[PDB]
Subunit: 277 residues, 4 copies
């Protein structure tokens, strides 16, 4: 949806987010590029001063570009030294830039290092089938890394359209009661279940009624990943179509032919359903 | 009437325990708060002056800058720069134990300088603004058949804030049994104090039922107690992959009894909707004949 | 009997969804986990080889290293180093557009190299260990007149951990009405699950009252359900000024029914107490005639 | 209390904590020092190779020290270049060190920047006096900075010795119920109160009984300081002696002679007490 006020950019809000999200190769290409053009600009600036670089072919961009590069990176070989206030002032400027550039490039790199992905797999569907004697809404999550997640929290939120007394129709949110919503240590898989008891918002609902109310289900996951020593977040949304009534997730905890327990995420998205003649 | 809290949630009271600075509390905050243009200017500033100070220190040792014009500040200044930034061309080289001891020291300063400047730059990167807009006013009107205190927030960025929650706190003066007058905070029960995905607009509501601290209050009674309303919002901003928060405060005057916020969406010429934050602060009201 | 959870709380199950690496998931974790000696060795390693690769790249361009011995790796290698580290003495200077394009590139690599190495070093600094010791066993004995599941932790550092809390979770196999067998977690009610200042030792307790998942269980019954006990501890370590956590797990075999932990303090020759972590795992038991 | 197992140091546990806590001046002196001795060692190493530094007085420490300094800092003037595999290998080594050194020195500096003090003042005493009709245990906190603290939490914990049924005497903790324990925005002062109702652990206690049980009171404060954009922690402990029975804190919110409201922390530690003829 379009906004009408100040829809784009601001302070510390250039496409800086892009430098945080984009792929490493693209990130390195952007930096490398920004590195070359800046040395291209200083190279010109030196030429715009005439022949202020000793031992350099007059009016040559090359020798001027490489002089810049040797100044900014602070390599300072010594054959291409500066000449006269003009060059020595651009050098002072270019010295500061390379320092700021490094400072920045290091900031962005450490940042990108600290915004890791949750590495959490969400089942492609939800199911509503009996558990402990009651119809239950379920879905499951799997930890795709060997590192464990500490203090994992999950929320199952129902979003649908309802009518107020004043006659207004708005989107209402419902944090659904889970049998377990907190997991001290998340390591493998976790089946999140919502018992549909008399207190449930979807009690008495059917696939049809949920469609009418434009019902949707949000799953929000958060925890402290040991792999990154910092919190991670992940979420998924499910529409009515993605709910398998009568479905039962296929166990993923396999017992190996040789007395060992194993987890086979290959069956993670499998649902067992009964068929009628 | 002095408002205890400003609109941006800050305090409007004077401090008499006046104690200026401390350790790690110089302008360390002024470098993290100020704007980039100023931040950069200040840094460049400390950069030039620092090189200036050294340039002089070399002159105090007389002529210790080989291949440099005697007494020249220019030549000593550019020697400093070349040294501190570690460019080290080779023409201006030092001379004698004195010049070389400054070099060693100046080398450490530029080293520490880079480290500090890199810290500041990163830190400034880790204090993103929440980009959350508060409605200029609050309103009290019917929702689900009950008078409800309302106000709203809007996300000013395209990226969404998740695991967001809000706090609506009443602040007023009261009198204890011991006949003491004090200011007491009352966290207000919201119909919903969390938003899984905060992406457009959100109308926060406080039903004024029997359990409410303002149950039975009126514009007059709220005024006499000097009632104000504080709002804290927090969330995880995906844009920066880190948490953010926002605060706002309202006085009795900013409550429109009977008002209702107006739908914030318009229709572009083609026909598709669009959040018109221009109407975000608009409030509908019934006018009597 | 395969124990679902290892003692250090990790999983003892095999993964068949075998998918090795990804992005930002190379050995990025191996550099953060490994030991300093290895970390440094690996870095030094990548440092030498990288300079080695460039040294060769210059040789491919023939003789472009002025004042360097033709075909010499040694001279080209030390040119690389001098360039990448930006020392730039002045004797080995480049020659021709080819040599100068490598220099420009090598300058960027060392630049990025420093940034990365500085990141890793800082990161490794931000993953402190909790330095928390778990008792090798658990015990079930009377406290306040009730059988109580107990275990204890000890701080292995002089600095204290504050705002600490612990979690004792039972993990066992159960059968649903639909006749399904699954593993269910049961967070256990502790007499106290928080420690304001964790500095010495702490005995965590779970009274086994009517509300307990192990109310009425025995060593036999726990075994049949393959019951295990998971413990998570977290706190703010003042030593590093950041949060830390620790995990441990126990099997039925590690519960000493009737046992009691022994006071962990001794008496030095002078006469003052001292936490003897040597007795930390000791358990008193009554022996029958 | 002395520990008996492995009482001192370990990995990433050198007196590194000291480098994090110690004062800046001392920190800079330690770094500067570590900077000089390292260049003193390399200087020697070059001498232990003979005269491998061109244009340098033979066997001279000075010229060798400064050569090192010019190598490590990567200034590389060019008059003191290296000579023969020995020098060129120590240079490669010293190049790596300066890089690691900078990397480290920057780590420590940014760290020290991110472990700020809460800047919270605790009243020097506690009081037990009537509030809303009940005897109440109180104390107060003040924010010593203008920046505000978000999501401030405070706990008042009673620690005293009690006897179990098994006859064992141990230290029991009691998280005391506060009238308000959470403050969304902490800006000035905050009086933390514990109503001593029938449910209170100190109900019916006197100064004498609290002394016998070796009662103590812990106050723990935490919140997100805007000044540092990161959490802060502070705590204080109070003994029975520091409880003023019948005391009343002197209001600190002053009304300025000119219609303005002011906070005068000068009276923060003042308690009003009644006196008998
Ligand atoms: K350099
Ligand atoms: K140089
Ligand atoms: K040079
Ligand atoms: K030279």
């Amino acid at each position: 949806i379009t906004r009408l006020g100040l829809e784009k950019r601001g302070w510390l809000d250039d496409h800086y987010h892009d430098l945080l999200t984009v792929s490493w190769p693209v990130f390195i290409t952007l930096i490398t590029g920004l590195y070359l053009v800046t040395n291209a600009l200083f190279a010109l600036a030196y030429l715009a001063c005439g022949d202020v670089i000793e031992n350099a072919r007059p009016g040559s961009f090359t020798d001027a570009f490489f002089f810049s590069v040797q100044t900014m990176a602070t390599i300072g070989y010594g054959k291409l030294i500066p000449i006269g206030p003009l060059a020595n002032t651009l050098v002072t400027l270019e010295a500061l830039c390379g320092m700021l550039g490094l400072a920045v490039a290091a900031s962005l790199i450490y940042a990108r290092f600290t915004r890791p992905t949750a590495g959490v797999l969400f089942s492609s569907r939800m199911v509503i089938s009996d558990f402990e004697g009651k119809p239950t809404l379920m879905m499951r999550l799997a930890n795709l890394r060997i590192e464990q997640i500490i203090e994992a929290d999950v929320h199952l939120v129902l979003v649908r359209s309802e009518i107020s007394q004043e006659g207004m129709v708005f989107r209402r949110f419902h944090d659904l009661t889970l049998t377990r919503s907190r997991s001290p240590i998340f390591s493998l898989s976790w089946t999140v279940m919502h018992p549909i008891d008399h207190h449930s918002p979807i009690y008495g609902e059917t696939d049809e009624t949920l469609r009418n109310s434009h019902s949707e289900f949000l799953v929000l996951f958060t925890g402290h990943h040991e792999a990154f020593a910092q919190n991670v977040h992940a979420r998924h949304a499910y529409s009515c179509d993605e709910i398998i009534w009568g479905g039962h997730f296929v166990d993923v905890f396999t017992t190996l032919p040789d007395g060992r327990r194993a987890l086979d995420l290959g069956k993670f998205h499998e649902i067992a359903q009964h068929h009628h003649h």
